[PDB]
């Protein structure tokens, strides 16, 4: 509701991002030339489906805990009723992980950081959901073409999370207010830094939603063949958000 207040909001979000980013951009960048060997790829590819799923679910969920800490730190988030917090997190946490992914992604060889090295799509073949992995690496690759800064990742992912159109919200108008101000902080930081050229370059909305649905669909097929794996082996937080 003030210019000075939104300058503070930019600062708030960026700093909150750094405290919850799980890994600093250059710890990712520095590890790019650590690439899984052919023999190490076939090791991953020899794990069962449920075993690759639970290793993947585990790592996703440790990433998601950082995202949850991040959301808690977004203005007004804790002053929303618990229903709506849960709604924003169920709809947004995975979206934020997909954006945070571009940091851990090397566009040069289309690899992602996983268990201490970089691997390609083939690293994930035992998951049995290969159109999805390809979609996710494509998204990540289009995102890298944007060349986001850390500050832009902060402000943008705050905005993916704080969205008043999420279905299931009770207090839609309280979150419109919250989102409006983060829209302002984001637009503000871009015109200050002479980006803003990237507003039309940004993904739809749709797109991320489509990525998320695909992940849930895939998980749901997985659960058909392994019902109690999800209920007993998967982290509870992952189970809670996704099924």
């Amino acid at each position: 509701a003030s210019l000075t207040e939104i300058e503070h909001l930019v600062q708030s979000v960026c700093k909150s991002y750094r405290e919850t980013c799980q890994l600093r951009l250059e710890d990712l960048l520095r590890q790019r030339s650590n690439i899984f060997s052919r023999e190490e790829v076939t090791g991953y590819q020899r794990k069962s489906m449920w075993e690759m799923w639970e290793r993947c679910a585990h790592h996703l969920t440790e990433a998601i805990q950082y995202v949850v800490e991040f959301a808690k730190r977004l203005s007004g988030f804790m002053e929303l009723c618990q229903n709506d917090q849960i709604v924003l997190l169920k709809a947004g946490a995975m979206e934020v992980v997909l954006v945070r992914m571009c940091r851990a992604y090397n566009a040069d060889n289309r690899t992602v950081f996983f268990e201490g090295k970089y691997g390609g799509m083939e690293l994930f073949r035992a998951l049995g959901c290969s159109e999805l992995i390809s979609s996710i690496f494509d998204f990540s690759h289009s995102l890298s073409a944007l060349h986001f800064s850390e500050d832009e990742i902060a402000l943008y992912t705050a905005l993916v999370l704080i969205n008043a159109h999420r279905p299931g919200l009770q207090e839609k108008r309280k979150v419109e207010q919250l989102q409006y101000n983060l829209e302002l902080a984001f637009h503000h930081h871009l015109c200050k830094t002479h980006r803003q050229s990237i507003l039309a370059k940004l993904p739809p909305k749709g797109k991320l939603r489509s990525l998320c649905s695909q992940h849930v669909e895939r998980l749901q097929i997985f659960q058909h063949l392994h019902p109690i794996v999800v209920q007993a082996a998967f982290p509870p937080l992952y189970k809670e958000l996704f099924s």
Binding site: Q65, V68, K72, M78, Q82, Q85, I86, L89, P236, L237, E240, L241
Partner: peptide
């Protein structure tokens, strides 16, 4: 146990 989202949200 139940409801880990509730917990993460309540826990300072």
């Amino acid at each position: 146990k139940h409801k880990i989202l509730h917990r993460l949200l309540q826990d300072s």
